[PDB]
Design a protein around this ligand. Sequence first.
Ligand SMILES: Nc1ncnc2c1ncn2[C@@H]1O[C@H](COP(=O)(O)OP(=O)(O)O)[C@@H](O)[C@H]1O
Length: 229
Amino acid sequence: EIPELVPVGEMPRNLTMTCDRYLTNKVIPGTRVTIVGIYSIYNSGVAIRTPYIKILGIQSFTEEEEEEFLQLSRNPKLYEILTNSIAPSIFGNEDIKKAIVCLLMGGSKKILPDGMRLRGDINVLLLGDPGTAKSQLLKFVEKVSPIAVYTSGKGSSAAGLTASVQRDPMTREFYLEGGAMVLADGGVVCIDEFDKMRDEDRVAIHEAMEQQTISIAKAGITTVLNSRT
DNA sequence: CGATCGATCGATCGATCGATCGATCGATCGATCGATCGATCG
Ligand SMILES: Nc1ncnc2c1ncn2[C@@H]1O[C@H](COP(=O)(O)OP(=O)(O)O)[C@@H](O)[C@H]1O
């Protein structure tokens, strides 16, 4: 399930699904989908059978809401109203508010004629004195960004942040598994104490920041996975 | 009218501080090792 819909203190429930023939290889890890399928179980505790889904069909606003948001676009003070709306509990700080607003929208994607892609994400570093509500600014973004992941520098790892390869005990096969920086694909991630994380985690971030990709080379397999984070 | 003695200038040694380099010891992050328990195939 979506981590945004998961209240704190809970790990999102994971469910195994199977697809065959033309429905295979449509979705990679980190892709948000809508599922139509059959709920069932199969043996693989005392009698704890592992649930699984036979996939039948996967897909991946109100008219008045469109007019409501179009009216919001037509507001003469739209930019300043939204600027004030970002963390209204805090005072002043208009410039940092406005940059974070730019973070929410992000840039527009462009593709070179040679096939390369320009990174559209806007990444901002807060580098000031302690006690300036800089931690609170990240927390508010987590509650406004539809796709939001918040993690600390200390309690994170390159395998935890980026992708990893692990064996699924349900089907006894090695699966490619995404991480925190993979879940936040197509959204915004809030990392705190960025200075406190190790260089290897930073190095993996460099590929994500400047190429929107994560390259995995573990055990005896190599792969590259995109991450528009 | 020469005489006593008080007060300052420059040579000049020396001694006290500054600073730079170099040697030495301690604080600290990374590489390495172990373990245990899961499956895979022999
Ligand atoms: N301009 C401000 N308006 C309101 N509260 C503020 C402002 N600046 C700082 N604060 C207070 O500072 C706290 C957040 O500080 P935080 O960013 O967590 O400190 P740190 O930088 O050490 O992480 C909040 O409790 C908030 O009330």
